[PDB]
Amino acid sequence: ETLGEKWKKKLNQLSRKEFDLYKKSGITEVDRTEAKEGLKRGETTHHAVSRGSAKLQWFVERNMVIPEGRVIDLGCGRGGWSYYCAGLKKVTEVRGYTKGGPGHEEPVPMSTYGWNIVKLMSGKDVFYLPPEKCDTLLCDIGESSPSPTVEESRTIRVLKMVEPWLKNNQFCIKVLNPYMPTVIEHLERLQRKHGGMLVRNPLSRNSTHEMYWISNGTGNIVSSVNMVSRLLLNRFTMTHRRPTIEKDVDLGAGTR
């Protein structure tokens, strides 16, 4: 039994009250107040469509992934990662695919800086899409489950789906459950071939052990995974630490 599995058992034991306090303890989060009001009023410039823009920005501004050329955004949802990449100088095209419909997010049309290089398509189950040529491959897919074996299966499905899209390109791929032994085997095989490293984003909630496989970095996957499991186990032991509130992103306006 891994440290992550002991974390998962503990999380599953929490009451809704305890879980809601635990999930944001000591994390970082962007203040969405302005954007929510703006979006509610139908504004299409400046606002990010979700917390996803700031989440991807954290990696980009640290050069862990450097979006360039034709960017593919798998499971784009509302389009937060797609709209953020659109405004980056090295980016020439952004293609977003998402399933949408019941239980899933629909793309939100925006007029933020670089919207003209963006195409977001709904009714697209990425698990049935044939790979396309791209210079940057992004994927934020992975739905949480109280079962870590269901999450292990979901994580492996994502890792097997993204691999044909990887051809010496920049990438940022969520790994929903990175602590299950079989996932670790796949990540090690994938890192030997495609390089990169697993990184914990400070904007992630403590209710998920997700880590991102980014292309620009090296390191020991096992040690980075166990570091997160220890971090998350320590966060159950003290009273709620209010999250660090940061400014949300301004994605501007106009064509590129």
Tell which phi-psi region holds residue 77, choosing left (phi > 0), alpha (psi between -120 and 50) or beta.
left
Domain 1-256, second-level architecture: 3-Layer(aba) Sandwich (3.40)
Give the chain's end-to-end CA distance (angstroms, integer). Answer: 51
> Nearest 5°: phi and psi at 119?
-135, 115
50 labeled binding residue? yes
Annotated resolution, angstroms: 1.5
212 labelled as ligand-binding? yes
Q: What is the 3-state secondary structure (H, E, C) of 140-157?
A: CCCCCCCCHHHHHHHHHH
Nearest Cα to Cα of residue 69 among 130, 162, 138, 161? 138
Q: Per the annotation, does 125 bind a ligand?
A: yes
> Is 99 annotated to bind ligand?
yes
- The contacts of residue 196 (CB under 8 Å, 6+ apart) are 171, 213, 214, 215, 216, 217, 218
Q: How many CA atoms lie within 13 A of 31 on its CB side?
A: 6
Rounded to whole angstroms, the Cα distance separating 233 from 206 reads 9
Q: How was this structure determined?
A: X-ray
Residue 83 labelled as part of a binding site = no
The sheet carrying 69-74 orders its strands as: 118-121, 91-97, 69-74, 136-139, 170-175, 211-214, 197-199
The annotation status of 136 as a binding-site residue, yes or no, is no
Is 175 annotated in some ligand binding site? Answer: no
Question: What is the number of residues in the chain?
Answer: 256
